[PDB]
Symmetry: D3
Subunit: 175 residues, 6 copies
Amino acid sequence: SLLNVPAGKDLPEDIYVVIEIPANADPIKYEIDKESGALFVDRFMSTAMFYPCNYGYINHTLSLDGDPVDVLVPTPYPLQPGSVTRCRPVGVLKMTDEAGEDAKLVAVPHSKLSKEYDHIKDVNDLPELLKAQIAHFFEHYKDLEKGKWVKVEGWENAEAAKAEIVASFERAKNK
Amino acid sequence: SLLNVPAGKDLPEDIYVVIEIPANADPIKYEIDKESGALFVDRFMSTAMFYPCNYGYINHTLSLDGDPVDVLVPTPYPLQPGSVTRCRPVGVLKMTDEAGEDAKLVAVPHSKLSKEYDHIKDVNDLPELLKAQIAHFFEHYKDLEKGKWVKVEGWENAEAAKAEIVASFERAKNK
Amino acid sequence: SLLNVPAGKDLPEDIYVVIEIPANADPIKYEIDKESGALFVDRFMSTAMFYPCNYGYINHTLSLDGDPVDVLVPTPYPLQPGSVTRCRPVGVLKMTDEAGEDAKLVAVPHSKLSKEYDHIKDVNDLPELLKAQIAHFFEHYKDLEKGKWVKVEGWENAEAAKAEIVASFERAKNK
Amino acid sequence: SLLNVPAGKDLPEDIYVVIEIPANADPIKYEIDKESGALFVDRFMSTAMFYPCNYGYINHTLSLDGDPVDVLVPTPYPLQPGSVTRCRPVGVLKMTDEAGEDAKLVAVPHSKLSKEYDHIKDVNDLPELLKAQIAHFFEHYKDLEKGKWVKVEGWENAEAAKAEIVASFERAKNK
Amino acid sequence: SLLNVPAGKDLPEDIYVVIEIPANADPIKYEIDKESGALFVDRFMSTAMFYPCNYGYINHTLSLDGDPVDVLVPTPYPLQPGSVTRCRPVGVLKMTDEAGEDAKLVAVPHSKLSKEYDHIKDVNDLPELLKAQIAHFFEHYKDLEKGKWVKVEGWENAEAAKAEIVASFERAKNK
Amino acid sequence: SLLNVPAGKDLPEDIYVVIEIPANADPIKYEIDKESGALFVDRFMSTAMFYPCNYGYINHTLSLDGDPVDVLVPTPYPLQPGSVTRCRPVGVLKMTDEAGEDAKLVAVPHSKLSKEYDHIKDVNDLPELLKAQIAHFFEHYKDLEKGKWVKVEGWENAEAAKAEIVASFERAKNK
Ligand SMILES: [Cl-]
Ligand SMILES: [Cl-]
Ligand SMILES: [Cl-]
Ligand SMILES: [Cl-]
Ligand SMILES: [Cl-]
Ligand SMILES: [Cl-]
Ligand SMILES: [Cl-]
Ligand SMILES: [Cl-]
Ligand SMILES: [Cl-]
Ligand SMILES: [Cl-]
Ligand SMILES: [Cl-]
Ligand SMILES: [Cl-]
Ligand SMILES: [F-]
Ligand SMILES: [F-]
Ligand SMILES: [F-]
Ligand SMILES: [F-]
Ligand SMILES: [F-]
Ligand SMILES: [F-]
Ligand SMILES: [Mg+2]
Ligand SMILES: [Mg+2]
Ligand SMILES: [Mg+2]
Ligand SMILES: [Mg+2]
Ligand SMILES: [Mg+2]
Ligand SMILES: [Mg+2]
Ligand SMILES: [Mg+2]
Ligand SMILES: [Mg+2]
Ligand SMILES: [Mg+2]
Ligand SMILES: [Mg+2]
Ligand SMILES: [Mg+2]
Ligand SMILES: [Mg+2]
Ligand SMILES: [Mg+2]
Ligand SMILES: [Mg+2]
Ligand SMILES: [Mg+2]
Ligand SMILES: [Mg+2]
Ligand SMILES: [Mg+2]
Ligand SMILES: [Mg+2]
Ligand SMILES: [Mg+2]
Ligand SMILES: [Mg+2]
Ligand SMILES: [Mg+2]
Ligand SMILES: [Mg+2]
Ligand SMILES: [Mg+2]
Ligand SMILES: [Mg+2]
Ligand code: NA
Ligand code: NA
Ligand code: NA
Ligand code: NA
Ligand code: NA
Ligand code: NA
Ligand code: NA
Ligand code: NA
Ligand code: NA
Ligand code: NA
Ligand code: NA
Ligand code: NA
């Protein structure tokens, strides 16, 4: 099952991300169901927005929104929902939503998958346009869903991302 | 596994549908294999037709064609094969095929996924064009497959759909 | 050429819309060039948004942004850029942008193309979700493009849409 | 303009086909407008069917339905609406519809474009499945459009196709 | 799980192939992970090439590259990654790569799925273009990945393919 | 017509490129016909390769292969065949093919369309992977077409690209 995938080969620098939503896809918000491992439709998004990157989570982690910690993974081509990608964290967008605090990690494909992202070492190496698109997306994607809301609080660096990974891996572990 | 998804949160009004074939897709007829939970290609359809809605089944049900009961789910965008959608039954197309009687339920995305279909309470609220397309599809999609055939017998309302769900949930339960 | 297509068979109730951008497409903002009739890339949109409907213009009209008046056309399936669709106006989103006032008409496929939209007679017959998505789109799609901006000013009815069509058809005519 | 493309390099064996509808596409029935050369939406098809091959016409020809003669062109990948393909006729499906008699030619990509279809010399060399799909399509695609109808009358060989081409090229020529 | 799918209904003539990569897809090289059954991104291919056919493996087999034996499956439409197709072997491209010897079987959809490939009995019945495309693909797809390499050694017939299947099914069985 | 588009707003630094083939598309080699302006299928490519970037030409130029000079344009999303993009030359891949010498320019979207490529000033600023993919593509895409061949001769800088543009604009001008 997708429930039995590790958090990573060597957390926090070498992680696996389970993809739920491909980059640039139709506005279907899929989420993996914890007990079955199946991809469920969480909702049909109301705004005419798309995720700027592939979107998923790190297995065996727990955030403060009651879900595994969330990751954006830029790739040259969109990934399949339910697939798993080896990546390296490079930054994090801090934010809270209606279900609790809910950081959005950015992790790039691992060097072994591709050399394309090897030059992205830290958050300042991400394209400004991409970071700005990601922030705008999270600021606005819930604008038409009553009872769903966001506070975006800014970008933090790879060490912050890594600290989040470690802390979420510790959370699910005695939870 | 997709074999461990419930029939629904509160059958028959609140169901889960496992999707096998997206709306408006290529003519590959996928079916979930009961023992592995995998998506198998059942066949390459011979007619140049597509399913008017996403197509799948309710887990832990049994129809008279030896398969779980079949459901059509209209959505704004096609769903992924193998994904699961929470829905609400609104009508049923009665029909029989070569493998035995084989009703085609229509269920719309649950209000929690989207408000888009909340106005569809019963079968008369479905668009006439959509119902007519669905009936035509089932009347003709097997026209070029020898030994596969259909008798479409007309549309019935949400209570009939719900009765079918309950009865199929009872069938698999002592089968 | 696409420059020689009429404004419509019987303006303002029966119009032709030249499509520039399909619904639910990649964020490439195409515009027809007036002198060549070719589809040019105006820009690569910076926000992660898509047009909720097909988007184009009525030929031989002139708005206050120096362009033909702009139209959104809902369809069951996205249209090809450069194609032309016969439609019927049903409402208008009033708004201004950096290039001047710039109304966004909504027109549905003509009955002769499809009966699907015949029940949409006026702006109140459009789905609330669709109208809300359209307004949100225009409110936010320029949020990351410096020097591009929007003031959305609300929805008006089919007669207002029709008055706009007539007035823009008169503008280009002694311009 | 697409109005100025020849009927072919050497009719009837070497023709050009202007494509209006790609194979396996969404059910949007495009038609080139004779006076503008633009692709217009003729209608949104009501049945859940797709064209088994790319579909278009031979320029500077005239059929008995008031339109240029119609051609199906099988290709390995769907063609773009408005593109032009060099082909070789191999057979014809005879049929009439509401607008008058309306043969459906089949022509394969010319050897110069690809060697893939060089083995298809005549109608008996077309796959049986493809011919059967084409006939079924034309038998049924108008089943839900009132006032549109078809009589399919069977397959004829490459010489018959070629005779049709010549005769339609003569028709438009003193018409 | 995809790990519990059989090698086939009646090996070697009747096999199941688990698909990892669809025909004509984006250059994402997916591989099923043996212990989780999940689809992992193995790498982002560096060359601008696509697989000429759907690509996957026979479960419960073991090749000399440490992986299940690899199969190409031509279909009329691309298959979903993670789906399973019943097929019949018709030939094999012999080759070695950096991970060891690594034959590429070709197997066509079983007659029960479609009659389309029933005329392909042996390797000489495959289109020359398709075989040539497959060989060229394997000759060149690793050209830009350092440390990945190929020696293509030519085509062999259905009996050779079948012998490979049997031998790989025996290998994993006491391994 | 696409024949009446300028070479550029201010050649050679500010050019327009007419797109014939989108990036990452199916292997249909379209070419604009000079006398009609229509997109014709030149051929169905035999290798399983795709263009790494959008591909087209500069109007009103003439190369030594008897065609307008050829340009690759990287974009975030593939462009429509027949569309026109404003760009800035940054480098050139020198090469000859069977029809004569045939340089492949690389030009990035103009700053006015997007700021994404503003950091690419010269050929050394292009990603190494992209340049390597482009060279490999041209080295191999004709490998299965008899009588079509290539000699790739290496990368040259933006000034070389610009000199090519100027010289081709002069060639068509007294030709
Ligand atoms: Cl773990
Ligand atoms: Cl930002
Ligand atoms: Cl249950
Ligand atoms: Cl009906
Ligand atoms: Cl007019
Ligand atoms: Cl609104
Ligand atoms: Cl002619
Ligand atoms: Cl037939
Ligand atoms: Cl087995
Ligand atoms: Cl070969
Ligand atoms: Cl010029
Ligand atoms: Cl290079
Ligand atoms: F989450
Ligand atoms: F079933
Ligand atoms: F405009
Ligand atoms: F016609
Ligand atoms: F392998
Ligand atoms: F060229
Ligand atoms: Mg959630
Ligand atoms: Mg999450
Ligand atoms: Mg959240
Ligand atoms: Mg979350
Ligand atoms: Mg079945
Ligand atoms: Mg079923
Ligand atoms: Mg059935
Ligand atoms: Mg059934
Ligand atoms: Mg503009
Ligand atoms: Mg406009
Ligand atoms: Mg504007
Ligand atoms: Mg405007
Ligand atoms: Mg017609
Ligand atoms: Mg016609
Ligand atoms: Mg007709
Ligand atoms: Mg006709
Ligand atoms: Mg491998
Ligand atoms: Mg393998
Ligand atoms: Mg290998
Ligand atoms: Mg292998
Ligand atoms: Mg050429
Ligand atoms: Mg060229
Ligand atoms: Mg060339
Ligand atoms: Mg050239
Ligand atoms: Na998309
Ligand atoms: Na909200
Ligand atoms: Na489709
Ligand atoms: Na049948
Ligand atoms: Na899209
Ligand atoms: Na702005
Ligand atoms: Na399609
Ligand atoms: Na009819
Ligand atoms: Na593809
Ligand atoms: Na290599
Ligand atoms: Na593609
Ligand atoms: Na060659």
